[PDB]
């Protein structure tokens, strides 16, 4: 048992009736002094270290060559000038076991935290030494955290793709299904999560070439995708992860959900494929009135109307489909389907729930397409256009496949530094650079959509940590007030940066003219409503920072109308799973799951108290399972009104909650504007 592990395990040894939280600083100090300083490869100077790293195929020389060595040395000195110290053992452990560069034999540490931050900043700046120093200050202050792919792989020759979220539209044809399998394997090989929309595939029992009862439905394609994701396991260290989304009005919806039942037969079970369901307002209306609903065979609709079922407005087309004899449909119980969804989410946490009308009533790019499905983390909500993959020697009709590179603001550190605007703009610039440097060679629609849309995802983390470290209950009205003001400011400054980038580069995203940004319909609520804090306590937290007013939003609206917007999508709140430890921040905007996180690494167990946890703020670090999920829904809906994409929203349920409680939580989320529901976690 190592000394640092012994010190960390002393956290739970209560002394004087209170946890010994100070043992974590001792634990991290001992961890460093006894493992990291010993196992760190020694270089005489930065020049020798950089030459060794570049020569040994560690660092790409393309990005480093853009700077004179004096500039690189200055950036590295800027990174080390802060004297950054990890405040807890878990943060340093996570960094030096997951992200710190290690020799090919994985026995020595080539990168410190400062070295990794400096390399990432140099990669971001793209030759701008002052920009690189600004990035170094942003990341060393831990105001902005690049996503795990960008942070880990940036500047590395062996690096994989800096983007990790991929959404693919699958067309209803064998050629398209084969291409989807190939692209899913190609993207998983790169380590990115791949989400597929199966709503266009015809249901089981549909005809292929005037041959009836030939189609196998979406479950056969799901088995193919599950096998493909299992094969492309990314060395096996992280098993291949894929998500399949199906509209609730698809015929195969019941079979689609049955793949996640434990009692399901093994020939139907899909082990490695997450499933999400897209629920239009029509289904909720049908269940509310207890009316009998119908699930439609997609190919009959496509033949009758020449357009896909999921390409149409179900709230306008459901009655026409029901009344159309040429459309094939079978009756279902919408309330029975909702209860089945709740039961499945309780048993396995699946499927993800996407409220299509909640997403598309605020979607700015409905002209390009409506948001038909989400990603593997349930927070990516963008317009997609399906591709037409034809026969060999036939030209393909490449559509738009969704992808975004992620970054997270550290709310606590952004508020402590009073640098919301600067942090947001620098994060937007870094995300734009990552997007511009991405080129996927086996996903034509992904690459085309990356070029055309320039979609980025700027999330946030440490909301609960910041609130608890400030004497604010997560469920309290003041917490929602702060979230409203902060995320309104984030949206304002991200829109301003996008417009400024469009002005500087002279280009907007493809089909920007038809977006709600161009027509000004996006800014209606911001020019009509004031989002300043309504509580004095919350308003004081923003002291020293300028909170945009309706006049500021009017000016920004005029500026956007003049110059346009560079990004079709800017904000999405991803889970931010493992990089939160490095930042010593709570995960995303969700409430903390546990006050002290007990985990076993190797054969020694480690304890991770929530950042800033102490006796004074112990009660404010309320666990999610003890929280009223209605208040969590209220907070997420408050945040979501300023996020153009979705928010990964996990439901934390007690074992005593029935399926009716889960159904009520989902119905309240739909009522409150929640776009997606990620997971049903039960204590």
């Amino acid at each position: 048992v190592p000394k640092w592990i012994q010190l960390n395990n002393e956290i739970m040894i209560q002394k004087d009736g209170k946890f010994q939280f100070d043992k974590d600083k001792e634990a991290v100090h001992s961890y460093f002094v006894d493992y990291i300083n010993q196992n760190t490869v020694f270089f005489h100077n930065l020049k020798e270290k950089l030459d060794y790293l570049v020569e040994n195929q560690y660092y790409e020389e393309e990005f480093l060559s853009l700077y004179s060595f004096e500039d690189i040395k200055e950036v590295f000195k800027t990174a080390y000038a802060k004297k950054f110290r990890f405040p807890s053992f878990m943060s340093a452990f996570k960094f030096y076991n997951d992200y710190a560069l290690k020799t090919n034999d994985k026995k020595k540490i080539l990168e410190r935290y400062e070295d990794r931050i400096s390399i990432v900043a140099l990669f971001f700046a793209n030759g701008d030494t002052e920009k690189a120093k600004e990035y170094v200050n942003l990341m060393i202050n831990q105001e902005y955290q690049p996503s795990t792919p960008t942070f880990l792989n940036a500047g590395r020759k062996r690096r994989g793709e800096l983007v990790s979220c991929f959404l693919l539209e699958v067309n209803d044809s064998l050629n398209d299904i084969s291409r989807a399998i190939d692209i899913s394997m190609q993207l998983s090989k790169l380590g990115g999560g791949v989400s597929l929309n199966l709503s266009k595939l015809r249901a089981k029992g549909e005809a292929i070439k005037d041959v009836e009862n030939a189609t196998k439905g979406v479950v056969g394609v799901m088995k193919l995708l599950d096998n493909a994701f299992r094969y492309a396991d990314q060395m096996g260290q992280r098993q291949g992860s894929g998500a399949a989304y199906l509209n609730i009005f698809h015929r195969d919806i019941n079979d689609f959900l049955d793949t996640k039942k434990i009692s399901a037969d093994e020939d139907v079970r899909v082990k490695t494929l997450s499933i999400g369901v897209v629920i239009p307002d029509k289904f909720v209306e049908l269940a509310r009135e207890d009316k009998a609903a119908y699930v439609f065979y997609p190919h009959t609709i496509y033949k009758e109307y020449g357009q896909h079922m999921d390409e149409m407005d179900m709230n306008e087309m459901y009655d026409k489909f029901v009344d159309n004899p040429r459309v094939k449909k079978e009756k279902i119980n919408p309330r029975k389907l909702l209860e089945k969804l709740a039961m499945l989410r309780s048993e396995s946490g699946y499927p993800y729930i996407m409220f299509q009308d909640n997403v598309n009533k605020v979607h700015a790019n409905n002209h390009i397409s409506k948001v038909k499905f989400s990603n593997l983390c349930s927070e990516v909500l963008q317009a997609s256009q399906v591709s037409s993959y034809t026969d060999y020697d036939e030209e393909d009709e490449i559509g738009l496949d969704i992808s975004c590179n992620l970054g997270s603001l550290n709310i606590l550190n952004v508020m402590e530094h009073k640098s919301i605007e600067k942090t947001v703009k620098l994060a937007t610039d870094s995300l734009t650079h990552v997007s511009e440097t991405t080129d996927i060679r086996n996903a034509p629609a992904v690459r085309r959509a990356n070029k055309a849309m320039k979609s980025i995802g700027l999330g946030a983390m440490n909301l609960h940590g910041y609130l608890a470290q400030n004497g604010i209950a997560y469920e309290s009205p003041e917490a929602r007030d702060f979230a409203n003001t902060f995320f309104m400011m984030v949206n304002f400054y991200s829109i301003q940066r996008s417009a400024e980038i469009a002005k500087e580069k002279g280009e907007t995203f493809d089909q920007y003219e038809g977006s709600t940004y161009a027509t000004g319909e996006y800014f209606d609520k911001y020019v009509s409503t004031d989002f300043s804090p309504k509580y004095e306590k919350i308003a004081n937290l923003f002291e020293g920072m300028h909170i945009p007013t309706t006049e500021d939003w009017k000016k920004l609206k005029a500026f956007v109308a003049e110059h346009g917007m560079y990004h079709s999508y800017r904000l999405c709140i991803a889970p931010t799973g493992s990089i939160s430890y490095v930042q010593s921040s709570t995960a995303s905007v969700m409430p903390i799951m546990e006050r002290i996180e007990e985990r076993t690494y190797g054969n020694s167990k480690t304890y991770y108290p929530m950042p800033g946890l102490a006796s004074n703020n112990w009660f404010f670090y309320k666990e999610a399972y003890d929280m009223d999920m209605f208040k969590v829904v209220d907070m997420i809906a408050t945040i979501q009104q300023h996020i153009d994409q979705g928010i990964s929203f996990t439901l934390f349920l007690k074992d005593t909650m029935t399926t009716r409680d889960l159904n009520r939580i989902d119905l309240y989320a739909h009522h409150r504007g929640i776009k997606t529901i990620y997971y049903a976690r039960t204590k």
Binding site: V284, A287, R288, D290, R335, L338, E339, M343, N603, S604, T658, T659, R660, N663, R664, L667, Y668, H671
Partner: protein, 287 residues
């Protein structure tokens, strides 16, 4: 006064070895000496034999002779656990850690090991001697079953617990702890049924039944000593295991309502460390 609560406890403890992934033990197993691996395989093989007979013979036969559908349901459930869960879990462990030839050899070794054959002969003999409507033959078999549950398993359990307590073979150890948790409640339950029969007897008959129980315990104990030495001398632990089996012999006696027979001793502290659906109403759609 107790069957319903045992029924509920047994069914809530239901598990399958496949719930526990075993590939995590691969390295700590690889690192053990040949002597340690040999003792470990043999120990689990001895356990497998005991559970095989407890599941095939002991629990079903006691179930047959005990009156009452609920008592029979508990005993049937316990029987299933013995052979469908416990005995099988050992094969899951073997198939993970050992090559087929070593597995084949250890099962051949159980067939020819004289102490393991003797203990099986004695226990199964008593099970098969039960006579319908003869409560005394039934009591004797229940004593044998308690001795199997609460005493005889423990020369085997020692070693997985000894490793678990050092942070070694912890996945296999997790399986063993689940098995042990089951046997503890099985021994208590069968003990209570045995006490029911004992309490019906004259004082003279009771005196004879205590003699039977103590004579049987001593005979099993003497055999277990030789078995323990045979397995543990090569790993240096025989004296420690002997203290453990005496400790558990006292627990078996207590499960039978008898006073402890062996004096208390300090056990290795390592081993001690080794231990709904409701419908949606209309109002649910409005807030």
């Amino acid at each position: 006064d107790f069957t319903q609560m045992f029924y509920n406890q047994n069914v809530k403890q239901f598990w399958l070895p496949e719930e526990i992934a075993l590939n995590g033990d691969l390295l700590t197993w690889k690192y053990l000496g040949k002597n340690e691996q040999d003792t470990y395989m043999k120990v689990l093989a001895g356990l497998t034999l005991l559970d095989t007979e407890q599941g095939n013979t002991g629990m079903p036969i006691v179930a047959e002779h005990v009156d009452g559908h609920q008592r029979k349901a508990v005993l049937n459930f316990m029987a299933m656990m013995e052979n469908a869960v416990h005995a099988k879990s050992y094969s899951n462990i073997f198939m993970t850690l050992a090559p087929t030839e070593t597995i084949n050899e250890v099962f051949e070794w159980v067939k020819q090991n004289k102490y393991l054959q003797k203990k099986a002969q004695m226990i199964v003999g008593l099970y098969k001697a039960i006579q319908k409507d003869d409560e005394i033959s039934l009591f004797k078999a229940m004593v044998a079953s308690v001795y199997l549950e609460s005493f005889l398993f423990y020369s085997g359990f020692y070693y997985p617990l000894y490793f678990y307590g050092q942070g070694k073979l912890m996945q296999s150890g997790e399986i063993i702890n689940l098995i042990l948790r089951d046997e503890a409640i099985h021994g208590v339950y069968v003990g209570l049924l045995a006490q029911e029969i004992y309490n019906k007897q004259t004082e003279e008959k009771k005196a004879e039944l205590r003699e039977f129980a103590i004579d049987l315990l001593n005979q099993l104990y003497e055999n277990e000593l030789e078995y323990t030495e045979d397995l543990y001398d090569q790993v240096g632990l025989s004296h420690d295991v002997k203290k453990f089996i005496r400790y558990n012999a006292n627990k078996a006696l207590m499960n039978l309502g008898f006073d402890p027979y062996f004096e208390e001793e300090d056990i290795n502290p390592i081993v001690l460390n080794g231990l709904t659906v409701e419908p949606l109403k209309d109002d649910d759609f409005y807030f």
